[PDB]
Amino acid sequence: ADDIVLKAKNGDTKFPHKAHQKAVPDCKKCHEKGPGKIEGFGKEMAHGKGCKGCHEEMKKGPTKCGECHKK
Ligand code: HEC
Numbered sequence: 406a407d408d409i410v411l412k413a414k415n416g417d418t419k420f421p422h423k424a425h426q427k428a429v430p431d432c433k434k435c436h437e438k439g440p441g442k443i444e445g446f447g448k449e450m451a452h453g454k455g456c457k458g459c460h461e462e463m464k465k466g467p468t469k470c471g472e473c474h475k476k
Pocket residue numbers: 406407408409420421422425426427429430431432433434435436
């Protein structure tokens with residue numbers, strides 16, 4: 406499958422899967438979640454444990470605006 410880009414108004418946010426599969430061998434951090442996770446995602450999740458919060462917790466990955474958001 407292909408990587409996905411989230412169409413944030415302030416700048417596209419790419420999600421590169423290969424880097425994540427490699428750096429987060431605990432797949433259940435994102436996979437086999439209960440229902441609702443597709444509908445549930447948004448800015449609040451993304452800036453929390455959905456994206457940015459994990460980067461902060463794991464001490465690796467982009468945490469600055471212009472590192473995730475790219476026109
Ligand atoms: C969130 C940070 C994830 C982690 C950690 C892992 N996966 Fe993932 N996966 C995630 C998304 C959002 C997607 C769809 C978008 C995409 O970029 O592909 C996927 C997709 C997969 C797939 C299909 C990929 C393909 O190239 O066909 C597989 C087979 C998969 N994920 C498995 C997988 C495993 C085994 C992981 C742990 C080692 C793992 N993923 C981590 C989100 C996230």
